[PDB]
Design a protein around this ligand. Structure first.
Ligand SMILES: [Mg+2]
Ligand SMILES: [Mg+2]
Lengths: 64, 48, 48, 64
């Protein structure tokens, strides 16, 4: 729901003034920061999932 | 190993981090769309 | 460098791969929930 | 919309038969395969985003 700011929203009026390219580059930094963040959550997820795996496997073998 | 309690905490944390990626991915997708129409407006300028 | 055409293709590919993560993340989240209630049923057995 | 199969859906009747743990471990393999897939798309996304970045920056400097 975090909607675009005017600095992020590329309008036709922005193009008639020649700032569409700079607004597109602004989006580039933000997008690429949000890939890094969502990548960092990936590594965290993969680490939290991996320890549930150890816990569940350690109990499966308690039955055995 | 880890307790049953710690196992539920990891469980609660995993669910919220999934919800967090969903929200980040919705934001990131909204911004990819803007670059989409910019490229299109510059492409559609290129044809005409 | 890359053409304007290749730039639009990367654009179209990025949007679909985002849509694909959304669908994978919805599947993965549904399965995390099942482990959630299993742990809870085993936890709620542990109290009683 | 890819809903759980009965092999994936852990019921109370599964617990009364002692197969909840194995179904939970089945979920573990699938979840962890889907983290790897969503991680692989991350790397692909980060690489496709990075080349739009080069293209947009190379045009910003053409104006200059
Ligand atoms: Mg604007
Ligand atoms: Mg079942």
């Amino acid at each position: 729901e975090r909607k675009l700011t005017p600095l992020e929203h590329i309008t036709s009026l922005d193009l008639k003034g020649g700032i569409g390219i700079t607004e597109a580059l602004r989006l580039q930094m933000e997008v690429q920061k949000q890939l890094h963040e969502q990548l960092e959550i990936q590594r965290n997820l993969q680490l939290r999932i991996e320890e549930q795996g150890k816990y569940l496997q350690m109990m499966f073998e308690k039955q055995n």
